[PDB]
């Protein structure tokens, strides 16, 4: 029931020979795994933690100047010198001013002038980095037991969370009553934390590209620097003003916090106050359902009366969830649940909370099932007092096919070349598709890095037009496909 | 002389008294008393709702977030009528004086 | 049974506490305190002065 009520649900159906399935886990998403003899499980990536961050650069977003000094030299005497030019905590500039008898000079020319001021940082943004071995993905595996944890906390069940680290990427959950599940994850491929910086700025943290971070035009410290006083690009945070040729001056350029916020658009925000927590990204895992068994398959039908205690509702995914209570004898019984037609001649829908059972009489169990599009009837119980529930599913099968194609394409857009692993059961077609996607995505990312979505749409339109106005059919079709894919990615790029 | 203020821009603000209101799917928009006040910046959006968070339906429930906007620094922009435009000129003859 | 109200619509209103403020030409916009809360319906316009 944890995975219900989340609009980004994914249904992964089927395990291969070996009883394993490849599932990508995303933070905002959730995965419901359906296997034939296995119970239905819900997998959610609820946390990614980076530990032991190391700073590589401390940028200055707000500074001040305190000790301004000037040296002036008469024309043809060369540029002047201040003793504080050697000082790395001072920012200096060389200019020229008009000189002559009026200035106490005696030569009437452009006399070089140098002005220096002490650069002091008042606000900085850290750029901590983390080693890929220090990530820790937390995952919650919850099965469709149809039951609840129960408020009585003296016993706490149904809450198995597994931590996955690059060192320990294989772990098993012990779901009570359902055996155990094995997750064979690959954290080292989910995110390249050697090309990412945990940018923290005034109680707000972002995850950013490392080259982008190193390219920022603000003054920076090495990161091990413990006293400031050696800022590198101090000239980017100051301005030297020589109106006409009378005097030279230097002033600071105000807090760069808002300009940084503008620069950070397109960077995913993370948390860095109580640990470095990243609620973004994906995990590729292999699900080992071999030692996963349905609970209570030795039980018998209830042969009793059920009452609906939570009225049937339709989730955002085309399934229906209902909560029924059993009022009969033989408490540990399988619940007779069918999605038939009006005459009950055909089975039209397949339930999702597979093998719904009653463990205690006074313990409601909520069933999730997938009805067909249109009229359908939910039948619960057996002939005496059997409760028959009607339902109408408003969609269309063609509409569902379109929605699933759209969802698959969107997954490809986000997890490019990793979308081939979301539900893959091995196979040769999946491998060929993934290899082709890797080869094509290498070129696409090379040719489209650092381009805004508007530029992507423009380039897609241009390429589509070029392909349309192409004599060669072999070139025209390829160009049109490239243009349409570019247009799609540009229309669904910013996230 | 005597410039007149034409507009004050805010360059540094702060948000306080943040509040939110939610409504179940298909039941319309949530209401916040602070929406009436213009010192509060507000936005309407949709969140996932369902049995888990107390709704009988499983759609996109509307939500409204309101926070009080307070300005901390200004960028006042003033204007001057050309009449109050004292220019100053210095005329020095080539008298040849020593200084 | 037990329907939930989705929206109220105003078919008969009234106006009270009318206020106005002007600013000299090229000095920007007039400012009214009543413009602060959304109970007051307001509009900006130009009148020669």
């Amino acid at each position, epitope marked *: 029931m944890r995975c219900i009520g989340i609009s980004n649900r994914d249904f992964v159906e089927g395990v291969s020979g070996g009883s394993w399935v490849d599932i990508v886990l995303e933070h905002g998403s959730c995965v419901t795994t359906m296997a034939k003899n296995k119970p239905t499980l819900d997998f*959610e990536l*609820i*946390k990614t933690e980076a530990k032991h961050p190391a700073t590589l650069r401390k940028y200055c977003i707000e500074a001040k100047l305190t000790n301004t000094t000037t040296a002036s030299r008469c024309p043809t005497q060369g540029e002047p010198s201040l003793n504080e030019e050697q000082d790395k905590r001072f920012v200096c500039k060389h200019s020229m001013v008009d000189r002559g008898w009026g200035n106490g000079c005696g030569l009437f020319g452009k006399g070089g002038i140098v002005t220096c001021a002490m650069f002091t940082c008042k606000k900085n943004m850290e750029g901590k980095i983390v080693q890929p071995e220090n990530l820790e993905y937390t995952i*919650v595996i919850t099965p469709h037991s149809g039951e*609840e944890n*129960a*408020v*009585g*906390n*003296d*016993t706490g069940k149904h809450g198995k969370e597994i931590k996955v680290t690059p060192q320990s990427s294989i772990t098993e959950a012990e779901l009570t009553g359902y055996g155990t599940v094995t997750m064979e994850c690959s954290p080292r491929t989910g995110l390249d934390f050697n090309e990412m910086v945990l940018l923290q700025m005034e109680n707000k943290a972002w995850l950013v590209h490392r080259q982008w971070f190193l390219d920022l035009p603000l003054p920076w410290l090495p990161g091990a620097d413990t006293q400031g006083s050696n800022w590198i690009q101090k000239e980017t945070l100051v301005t030297f003003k020589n109106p006409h040729a009378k005097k030279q001056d230097v002033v600071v350029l105000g807090s760069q916090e808002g300009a940084m916020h503008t620069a950070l658009t397109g960077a995913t925000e993370i948390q860095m*106050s*109580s640990g470095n*927590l990243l*609620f973004t990204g994906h995990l590729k895992c292999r699900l080992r359902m071999d030692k996963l068994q349905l609970k209570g398959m030795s039980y018998s039908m209830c042969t009793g009366k059920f009452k609906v*205690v*939570k009225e049937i509702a339709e989730t955002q995914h085309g399934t229906i969830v209902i909560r029924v209570q059993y009022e009969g004898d033989g408490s540990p019984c399988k619940i007779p649940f069918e999605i038939m037609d009006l005459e009950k001649r055909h089975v039209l829908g397949r339930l999702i909370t597979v093998n719904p059972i009653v463990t205690e*009489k*006074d313990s*409601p169990v909520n069933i999730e099932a997938e009805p067909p599009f249109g009229d359908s009837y939910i039948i619960i119980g057996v002939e005496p007092g059997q409760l028959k529930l009607s339902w109408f599913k408003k969609g269309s099968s063609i509409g569902q096919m379109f929605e699933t194609t759209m969802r698959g394409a969107k997954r490809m857009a986000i997890l490019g070349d990793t979308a081939w692993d979301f539900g893959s059961l091995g196979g040769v077609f999946t491998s060929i598709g993934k290899a082709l996607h890797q080869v094509f995505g290498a070129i696409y990312g090379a040719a489209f890095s650092g381009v805004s979505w508007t530029m992507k749409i423009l380039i897609g339109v241009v390429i589509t037009w070029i392909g349309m106005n192409s004599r060669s059919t072999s070139l025209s079709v390829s160009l049109v496909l490239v243009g349409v894919v570019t247009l799609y990615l540009g229309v669904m790029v910013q996230a | 002389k005597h410039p007149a203020t034409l507009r004050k821009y805010c360059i540094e603000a702060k948000l306080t008294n943040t*509040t*939110t*209101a*939610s*409504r*179940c799917p298909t*039941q319309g928009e*949530p*209401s*916040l008393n602070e929406e009436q006040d213009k010192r509060f910046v507000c936005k309407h959006s949709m969140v996932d709702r369902g*049995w*888990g*968070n*107390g*709704c*009988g339906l499983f759609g996109k429930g509307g939500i409204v977030t309101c926070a009080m906007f307070t300005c901390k620094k200004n960028m006042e922009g003033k204007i001057v009528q050309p009449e109050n435009l004292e220019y100053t000129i210095v005329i020095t003859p080539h008298s040849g004086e020593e200084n | *049974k*037990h329907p*939930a*109200t989705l929206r109220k619509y105003c078919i008969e209103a009234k106006l009270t506490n009318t206020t106005t403020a002007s600013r000299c030409p090229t000095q920007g916009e007039p400012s009214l305190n009543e413009e602060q809360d959304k109970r007051f319906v307001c509009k900006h316009s130009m009148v020669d002065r």
Partner: antibody
Amino acid sequence: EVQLVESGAEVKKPGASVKVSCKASGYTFTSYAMHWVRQAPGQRLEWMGWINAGNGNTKYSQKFQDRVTITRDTSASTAYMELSSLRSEDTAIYYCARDKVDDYGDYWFPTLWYFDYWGQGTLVTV
Amino acid sequence: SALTQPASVSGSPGQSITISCTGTSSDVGGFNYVSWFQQHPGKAPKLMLYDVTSRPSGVSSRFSGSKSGNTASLTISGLQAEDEADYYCSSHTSRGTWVFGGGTKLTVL
């Protein structure tokens, strides 16, 4: 066992301030939000506000908003409810009730079984 | 904004007695955050029902909850002497606060 224990009863005079604590044990203190609920002698339960032990966030009732301050001590797994400028109407038992926050650490939507565990109740008189 | 409940209620032992909690479209008419608390004298409130109908693990099955429009109801079927207590209704409102009922005193005699 998940037991919630609050400080002992206290006697204060009108115009003073009182701090009440609620010690949480048997569960991860940071995973749940702490609610303060006061009940005047022989009257209805009244909600005051909650503290999110995970991040120290708080939400107070419009009433009590200006007088009540809620704080937590992650080290001790303890929550505090400071009521300032006590009046004759503030004499009542002050209960603490928990509600789990979501896995993000954000406590905005409660759990259906909010207030499942309560403290014994601290009595304050003015 | 307090949820409205009858001041008092009495039922003969072994009978069934119902309690009402009338609220607004935001507290108990808009959301399923309806909870019933039982408070014996000198003791903290005890969660009797939640999500309208769901009852805690230790809570007897004699306690049943219903909700209709802006009103949520609590019913007791056994009416044992131990059931005589003060019952409070609470709801999580649309603005993010908790409102409590005025409480009903149930007496068996």
